[PDB]
Amino acid sequence: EKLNAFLVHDNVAFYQGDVDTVVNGVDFDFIVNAANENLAHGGGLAKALDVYTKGKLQRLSKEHIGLAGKVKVGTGVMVECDSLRIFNVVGPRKGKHERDLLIKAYNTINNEQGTPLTPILSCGIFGIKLETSLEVLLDVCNTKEVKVFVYTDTEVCKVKDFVSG
Protein backbone atom coordinates (compact mmCIF):
# COMPACT_ATOMS: atom_id res chain seq x y z
CA GLU A 1 0.00 0.00 0.00
CA LYS A 2 1.06 3.59 -0.68
CA LEU A 3 0.14 5.14 2.70
CA ASN A 4 2.43 4.24 5.60
CA ALA A 5 0.81 3.42 8.95
CA PHE A 6 1.86 5.83 11.72
CA LEU A 7 1.77 3.06 14.30
CA VAL A 8 1.39 -0.74 14.27
CA HIS A 9 0.30 -2.35 17.54
CA ASP A 10 0.29 -6.11 17.28
CA ASN A 11 -2.54 -6.88 14.78
CA VAL A 12 -3.84 -3.26 14.52
CA ALA A 13 -2.30 -0.65 12.18
CA PHE A 14 -3.18 3.04 12.33
CA TYR A 15 -3.35 5.47 9.41
CA GLN A 16 -4.01 9.21 9.01
CA GLY A 17 -6.02 10.65 6.16
CA ASP A 18 -9.27 11.81 4.68
CA VAL A 19 -11.41 9.34 2.71
CA ASP A 20 -9.72 10.02 -0.65
CA THR A 21 -6.36 9.40 0.99
CA VAL A 22 -7.19 6.19 2.89
CA VAL A 23 -9.34 4.60 0.15
CA ASN A 24 -6.54 5.12 -2.40
CA GLY A 25 -3.67 4.56 0.10
CA VAL A 26 -4.55 1.52 2.21
CA ASP A 27 -4.97 -2.17 1.33
CA PHE A 28 -8.27 -3.36 2.89
CA ASP A 29 -11.30 -5.50 2.03
CA PHE A 30 -14.03 -3.15 3.28
CA ILE A 31 -14.13 0.35 4.79
CA VAL A 32 -16.35 0.98 7.83
CA ASN A 33 -18.75 3.93 7.76
CA ALA A 34 -19.60 5.46 11.17
CA ALA A 35 -23.29 5.53 10.28
CA ASN A 36 -26.53 6.57 12.00
CA GLU A 37 -29.59 4.35 12.21
CA ASN A 38 -31.22 5.99 9.17
CA LEU A 39 -28.12 5.43 6.99
CA ALA A 40 -28.55 9.16 6.32
CA HIS A 41 -24.98 10.23 5.48
CA GLY A 42 -25.38 13.93 6.28
CA GLY A 43 -22.10 14.88 7.91
CA GLY A 44 -18.56 13.91 8.89
CA LEU A 45 -17.03 10.71 7.58
CA ALA A 46 -20.36 9.39 6.24
CA LYS A 47 -20.85 12.52 4.11
CA ALA A 48 -17.23 12.28 2.82
CA LEU A 49 -17.79 8.63 1.84
CA ASP A 50 -20.99 9.51 0.04
CA VAL A 51 -19.16 12.30 -1.81
CA TYR A 52 -16.37 9.83 -2.73
CA THR A 53 -18.95 7.41 -4.18
CA LYS A 54 -20.71 10.31 -6.04
CA GLY A 55 -23.93 9.65 -4.11
CA LYS A 56 -24.05 5.87 -4.76
CA LEU A 57 -23.63 5.13 -1.06
CA GLN A 58 -26.66 7.24 -0.14
CA ARG A 59 -28.84 5.82 -2.95
CA LEU A 60 -28.10 2.18 -1.99
CA SER A 61 -28.51 3.08 1.69
CA LYS A 62 -31.97 4.60 0.90
CA GLU A 63 -32.94 1.42 -0.98
CA HIS A 64 -31.95 -0.73 2.05
CA ILE A 65 -33.71 1.54 4.58
CA GLY A 66 -36.86 1.66 2.41
CA LEU A 67 -37.17 -2.14 2.57
CA ALA A 68 -35.67 -3.00 5.98
CA GLY A 69 -36.23 0.05 8.20
CA LYS A 70 -33.73 1.56 10.66
CA VAL A 71 -30.40 -0.15 11.38
CA LYS A 72 -30.07 -1.45 14.95
CA VAL A 73 -27.36 0.12 17.14
CA GLY A 74 -24.38 -2.24 17.23
CA THR A 75 -25.18 -3.82 13.85
CA GLY A 76 -23.98 -3.22 10.28
CA VAL A 77 -25.16 -3.15 6.69
CA MET A 78 -22.72 -3.76 3.82
CA VAL A 79 -23.20 -1.66 0.65
CA GLU A 80 -21.11 -2.28 -2.51
CA CYS A 81 -20.25 0.94 -4.39
CA ASP A 82 -18.42 -0.13 -7.54
CA SER A 83 -15.00 -1.42 -6.30
CA LEU A 84 -15.49 -0.07 -2.74
CA ARG A 85 -17.35 -2.12 -0.13
CA ILE A 86 -18.69 0.05 2.67
CA PHE A 87 -19.78 -1.51 5.95
CA ASN A 88 -22.20 0.86 7.60
CA VAL A 89 -21.90 0.28 11.36
CA VAL A 90 -24.07 2.13 13.92
CA GLY A 91 -22.18 2.91 17.08
CA PRO A 92 -23.91 3.99 20.30
CA ARG A 93 -24.21 7.50 21.71
CA LYS A 94 -22.74 8.36 25.11
CA GLY A 95 -24.89 6.77 27.81
CA LYS A 96 -25.20 4.07 30.50
CA HIS A 97 -25.00 1.02 28.18
CA GLU A 98 -22.45 2.55 25.78
CA ARG A 99 -19.75 -0.07 26.51
CA ASP A 100 -21.93 -3.09 25.80
CA LEU A 101 -23.06 -1.50 22.51
CA LEU A 102 -19.48 -0.57 21.52
CA ILE A 103 -18.46 -4.16 22.18
CA LYS A 104 -21.32 -5.30 19.91
CA ALA A 105 -20.40 -2.78 17.17
CA TYR A 106 -16.72 -3.76 17.22
CA ASN A 107 -17.64 -7.47 17.19
CA THR A 108 -19.79 -6.75 14.13
CA ILE A 109 -16.70 -5.32 12.42
CA ASN A 110 -14.38 -8.09 13.72
CA ASN A 111 -16.79 -10.84 12.61
CA GLU A 112 -17.40 -9.48 9.09
CA GLN A 113 -15.14 -11.41 6.67
CA GLY A 114 -12.11 -9.48 5.45
CA THR A 115 -9.61 -6.86 6.55
CA PRO A 116 -11.54 -3.82 7.83
CA LEU A 117 -10.35 -0.23 7.50
CA THR A 118 -12.32 1.46 10.29
CA PRO A 119 -12.66 4.76 12.12
CA ILE A 120 -12.78 4.83 15.91
CA LEU A 121 -16.55 4.61 16.49
CA SER A 122 -18.87 7.00 18.39
CA CYS A 123 -16.49 9.97 18.46
CA GLY A 124 -17.67 13.41 17.45
CA ILE A 125 -21.43 14.01 17.67
CA PHE A 126 -22.10 10.62 19.31
CA GLY A 127 -20.07 11.96 22.24
CA ILE A 128 -17.90 9.01 23.34
CA LYS A 129 -14.27 9.73 24.26
CA LEU A 130 -11.77 8.61 21.61
CA GLU A 131 -9.62 6.69 24.11
CA THR A 132 -12.71 4.94 25.55
CA SER A 133 -13.80 3.70 22.11
CA LEU A 134 -10.22 2.82 21.10
CA GLU A 135 -9.80 0.67 24.20
CA VAL A 136 -12.78 -1.43 23.19
CA LEU A 137 -11.53 -1.57 19.62
CA LEU A 138 -8.14 -3.03 20.70
CA ASP A 139 -9.76 -5.41 23.21
CA VAL A 140 -12.24 -6.88 20.68
CA CYS A 141 -10.07 -6.81 17.53
CA ASN A 142 -7.27 -8.95 18.86
CA THR A 143 -6.74 -11.55 16.11
CA LYS A 144 -7.19 -10.72 12.38
CA GLU A 145 -5.43 -7.65 10.97
CA VAL A 146 -7.59 -4.52 11.49
CA LYS A 147 -6.71 -1.12 10.06
CA VAL A 148 -7.84 2.03 11.84
CA PHE A 149 -7.87 5.58 10.47
CA VAL A 150 -8.13 9.05 11.95
CA TYR A 151 -8.28 12.42 10.28
CA THR A 152 -6.63 15.10 12.43
CA ASP A 153 -3.16 15.56 13.96
CA THR A 154 -4.78 15.76 17.42
CA GLU A 155 -6.45 12.39 16.90
CA VAL A 156 -3.08 10.95 15.82
CA CYS A 157 -1.47 12.30 18.99
CA LYS A 158 -4.20 10.80 21.21
CA VAL A 159 -3.83 7.42 19.54
CA LYS A 160 -0.05 7.40 19.96
CA ASP A 161 -0.34 8.58 23.59
CA PHE A 162 -2.95 5.93 24.44
CA VAL A 163 -1.20 2.97 22.84
CA SER A 164 2.46 3.95 23.24
CA GLY A 165 2.51 6.47 26.15
From Swiss-Prot:
Coiled coil: none annotated. It catalyses: Thiol-dependent hydrolysis of ester, thioester, amide, peptide and isopeptide bonds formed by the C-terminal Gly of ubiquitin (a 76-residue protein attached to proteins as an intracellular targeting signal). It is found in: Host membrane. It comes from the Viruses. Residues 1-165 form the Macro domain. It is a multi-pass membrane protein. This is Non-structural protein 3. The chain holds residues 1270 to 1434 of 6758 of the full protein.
